[PDB]
């Protein structure tokens, strides 16, 4: 009765900013000590939908699983506010580096714009429109040199009520949100990135540059820079949206291919042989074994944890989507055996392995699936991280849990620890 949802697990560390729907602020784990970014969002003032509305919509987006694409763990509420507890960044924004570099090599910038031509291709595919996408809503998820970026600031402009000038497209200028404004949004990064300039340069003046819609590559930073970039970027700022290219089309460009080719190594054998066994003895366990170890992978781990395996995750993958996908298991398995020297069915392996890790049924395996499998299951048995995990599902809290009130998919928790060993 003298509990409450979200001061029981969280305790409150410190304020982080104002996001535009509410405060953001970090907060800790009391069993756990894992910390984690909650956005505060008032109820009174900021809804304009029924409660119900709202807690769909943030479903939807709390099985977002993309790199670049911020995450969602779970939505709680008192009689003031809603608490959205999501992953922690600590990098800042993207903005901020630009700051500092003032403008990137096309080496650079082809990295940092295939993440983000990945994530609006994901958000695209599950039909999100981002709307407001700049440097400022891009944020880095540490310091570290190549860190993957984390798209953040959207979903909510249906639900709740709460610069710009250069990256919105001209079509928003005239009362429309399609999905192809991002794809100018991008464009105008992409050209900030390579020169250090807006494209469409009072506020008056810039906006009426953007509804002509013309921009040039006469500054004298553009004499160096290749065609294909020219041409990429020419096929983002096309002035009608129907002739605009696609958020796919972007990140298959030969221009980004051309840098997108992070492909493993010999020094990436001791984590690709790791990988492998825990792998199989994932596919080995039952099926209530493996969905309680994918249950703790997605909700209760941390990038530094998994820092190891993410390298690995983005040499796999190819084509760059963010996902890991049948033909692309066989080529890294092929491409595994090749670095050690041992000549390779690898096929009917994968096609029983694929149904067993791509638990959603999504047709590809995602990060939180390959972490799931590819992790030591010793991180994932800490007393912490179990004692966390069974007060999730003991609704009651009576210190036994029921048998329906087991939804992993009366024990004590000293019964429950046996259960998952
Ligand atoms: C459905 C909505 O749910 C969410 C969930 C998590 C969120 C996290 C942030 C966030 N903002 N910031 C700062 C704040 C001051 O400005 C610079 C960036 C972080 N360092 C954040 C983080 N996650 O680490 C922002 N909005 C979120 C919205
Ligand atoms: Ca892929
Ligand atoms: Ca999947």
């Given amino acids: ?104 090599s096309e080496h650079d910038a082809a990295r940092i714009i295939k993440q983000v031509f990945s994530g609006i291709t994901y958000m695209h595919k599950h039909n999100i429109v981002h709307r407001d996408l700049k440097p400022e809503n891009i944020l880095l998820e540490s310091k570290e040199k190549d860190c993957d970026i984390k798209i953040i600031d959207f979903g909510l402009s249906t639900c709740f009520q709460q610069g710009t000038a250069y990256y919105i497209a001209p079509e928003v200028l005239r009362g429309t949100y399609d999905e192809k404004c991002d794809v100018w949004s991008a464009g105008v990064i992409l050209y900030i990135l390579l020169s250090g300039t807006p494209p469409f340069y ?47 089309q972007c990140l298959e460009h030969p221009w980004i291919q051309k840098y997108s080719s992070e492909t493993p190594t010999i020094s990436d054998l001791p984590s690709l042989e790791s990988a492998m066994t825990n792998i199989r003895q994932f596919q080995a366990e039952k099926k209530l074994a493996q969905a309680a170890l994918l249950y703790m992978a997605s909700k209760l781990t941390t990038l530094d944890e998994t820092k190891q395996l993410t390298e690995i995750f983005r040499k796999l993958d190819t084509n760059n989507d963010g996902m890991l996908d049948r033909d692309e298991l066989v080529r890294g398995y092929h491409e595994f055996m090749r670095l050690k020297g041992v000549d390779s ?33 010793t991180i994932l048995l800490s007393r912490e991280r179990m004692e966390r995990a069974f007060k999730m599902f003991d609704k009651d809290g009576s210190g036994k849990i029921s048998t329906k009130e087991l939804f992993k998919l009366e024990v004590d928790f000293n019964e429950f620890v046996e259960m998952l060993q």
């Fill in 1 to 104: 009765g003298h509990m409450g949802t979200f001061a029981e697990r969280y305790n409150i560390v410190c304020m982080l900013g104002k996001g535009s729907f509410g405060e953001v602020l970090k907060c800790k784990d009391r069993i756990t000590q894992q910390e984690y970014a909650v956005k505060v969002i008032n109820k009174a003032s900021a809804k304009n939908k029924d409660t119900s509305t709202i807690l769909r919509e943030v479903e939807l987006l709390k099985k977002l699983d993309h790199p670049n694409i911020m995450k969602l763990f779970e939505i709680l509420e008192d009689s003031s506010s809603f608490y959205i507890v999501g992953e922690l960044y600590t990098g800042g924004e993207l903005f901020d580096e630009i700051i500092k570099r003032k403008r990137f």
């Fill in 202 to 248: 009072n506020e008056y003046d810039i906006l009426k540059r953007v509804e002509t819609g013309k921009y040039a590559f006469d500054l004298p930073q553009w004499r160096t820079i290749s065609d294909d970039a020219k041409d990429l970027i020419r096929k983002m700022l096309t002035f009608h949206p129907s002739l605009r290219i696609t958020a796919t």
């Fill in 345 to 377: 069915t690898i096929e009917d392996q994968i096609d029983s392995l694929m149904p067993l890790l791509d638990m959603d049924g999504s047709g590809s395996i995602e990060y939180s699936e390959f972490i799931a499998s590819a992790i030591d299951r």
